[PDB]
Design a protein around this ligand. Structure first.
Ligand SMILES: Cn1cnc(Cn2c(=O)nc(Nc3cc4cn(C)nc4cc3Cl)n(Cc3cc(F)c(F)cc3F)c2=O)n1
Ligand SMILES: Cn1cnc(Cn2c(=O)nc(Nc3cc4cn(C)nc4cc3Cl)n(Cc3cc(F)c(F)cc3F)c2=O)n1
Lengths: 301, 298
């Protein structure tokens, strides 16, 4: 009972965060086995960050230019290399708290937990979604660069996001752990805009099922619609179209509530055309789109 | 603003499973003591009207199964303190953090580590409501999950989850086993009082709005604390205490807006409604003055 924005327990990840400093530039890094991963932006001085030539900046540095701090313990850098936008620092000590982990690239619409860190110290955890325009609406202050996003799958930590930068609208941009940006961004200190965002329709529907499970039912009606007729209206309002794969993924929540997906779509279509009219759903006055169907199942089953 | 929880790692290493018979729930292992709800000593026929003193007399140390994962911790002593059982085990937990037990007041926020079978499953932030419930998220098997705050290096444990009420909200104790609210640990339907809006947290949210440049609602007038408190009651808002005025001081200083001037602004919103938004069309009441500062400054 109840419904909350829930993150995964962060303990497996907390043991892997460190501070990386190069000159006076400092940020957070991720220590797994005997490698520290961090944004390559750390090798920039203040002059370099506007238009960095990273290959050049990197050849001009040596192992002892890198100061890696794990709490009070100092790790010794014995090698380094660039992979896209992520620096890989080989250190002489393996992390004994290394979890079972893999690196994954997630898709727009999917959610993950963010461990926000400052000077190598974990400070907060929260859940967010990859937006369709490849940004995330995070909560980050100066010094958060290199914080990571992750999901837990039984015993295995899937790392999917490494935080790089804030955009002028206050949303955030980053890479996967292979160093490739989500979206059309580049790791330099220039003002960059994102593409236009859309609402994640399959997530809205999952959240409407959670509301029904928790007793909020005022928006239901006895009508149904077809997939195509629903998608025409959704497109009009800048909602993502629904595919048959989405209909399948909502199956378990449709079975648990007895409300068919296309029946829910008919409710959502009415909401798009007429609004909430001052009513709320699960305490929200806006349609929430950052819970996946799987998120809802974890919390309501 | 996100609802952001504290990192849970220091607490995850203290979670265990406690079983008595087939009744199972979560416990908290600190040093050589396991804390858990005393409801664990009930069979199904006892849960509706348990005589805890009678049930405990018939229990021996060797009736308690305490497991950290698959590893059994042998119980060498037991006592009951209000609604929590304290189980002395033969192993001091080597992951015990620096910790203290605190009793929080309504309006205060904390992180909840939701656990099932002694295994951590999710973390989230919530506030204690003025009617001493929490609007949590808990399924069956979550009894004994704990709520906490982190102050620097030290974990402050403030909440042990016990039960779900008929309206779907949740009730529990502090770590000395004293319930928050007028509830009792039996399987009967119990009603919580009517909830009110947490005024001190609404004021913190209005200060955060001002800090970020959103300040249309600031009005030219001031009020007294007594006038404000009597108005708030009429709208199902909590009256302010002297402690509330004090914890708002830093935000007042940062913005140069006196607390009572902000109260006069809220009073207007209460009597006239809003038309535009703030930051949202709804006034948020689960961010404390500490939460605001922690997310705006660090
Ligand atoms: C407000 N906010 C929200 N998220 C962020 C993340 N972030 C950050 O933490 N730091 C950045 N630049 C740095 C400045 C430094 C000054 N010192 C002494 N050391 C510093 C290290 C960093 Cl990383 N930036 C900006 C930024 C970081 C990048 F990785 C990048 F490729 C381009 C950028 F413009 C930043 O966004 N701040
Ligand atoms: C849906 N929901 C949300 N929160 C809760 C919390 N909660 C819980 O997890 N378990 C409870 N009763 C038990 C039944 C058991 C069956 N077995 C085999 N073992 C069991 C152990 C427990 Cl604790 N309850 C009910 C409950 C628990 C109490 F501690 C109490 F004092 C009164 C109560 F009615 C419960 O609310 N479920």
């Amino acid at each position: 009972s109840g419904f909350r924005k829930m993150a995964f327990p962060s303990g497996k990840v907390e043991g892997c965060m460190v501070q990386v400093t190069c000159g006076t530039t400092t940020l957070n890094g991720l220590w797994l086995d005997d490698v520290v991963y961090c944004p390559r932006h750390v090798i920039c001085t203040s002059e370099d960050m506007l238009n960095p030539n990273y290959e050049d900046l990197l050849i001009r540095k040596s192992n002892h230019n890198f100061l890696v701090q794990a709490g009070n313990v100092q790790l010794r850098v014995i090698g380094h290399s660039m992979q896209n936008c992520v620096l890989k620092l080989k250190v002489d000590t393996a992390n004994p708290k290394t979890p079972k982990y893999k690196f994954v690239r997630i898709q727009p619409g999917q959610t993950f937990s963010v461990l926000a860190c400052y000077n190598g110290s974990p400070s907060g955890v929260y859940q967010c979604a990859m937006r369709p325009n490849f940004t995330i609406k995070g909560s980050f202050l100066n010094g958060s660069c290199g914080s990571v996003g992750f999901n837990i799958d039984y015993d295995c930590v899937s790392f999917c996001y490494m935080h790089h930068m804030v955009l002028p609208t206050g949303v955030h941009a980053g890479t996967d752990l292979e160093g490739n940006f989500y979206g059309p961004f580049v790791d330099r200190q220039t003002a960059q805009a994102a593409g236009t965002d859309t609402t994640i329709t399959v997530n809205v529907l999952a959240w409407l099922y959670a509301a029904v499970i928790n007793g909020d039912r005022w928006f239901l009606n006895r009508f149904t619609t077809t997939l195509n007729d629903f998608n025409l209206v959704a497109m009009k309002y800048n909602y993502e179209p629904l595919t048959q794969d989405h209909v399948d993924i909502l199956g378990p929540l449709s079975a648990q509530t007895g409300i068919a997906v296309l029946d829910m779509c008919a409710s959502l279509k009415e909401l798009l055309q007429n609004g909430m009219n001052g009513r709320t759903i699960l305490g929200s006055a806006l349609l929430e789109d950052e819970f996946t169907p799987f998120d809802v199942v974890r919390q309501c089953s």
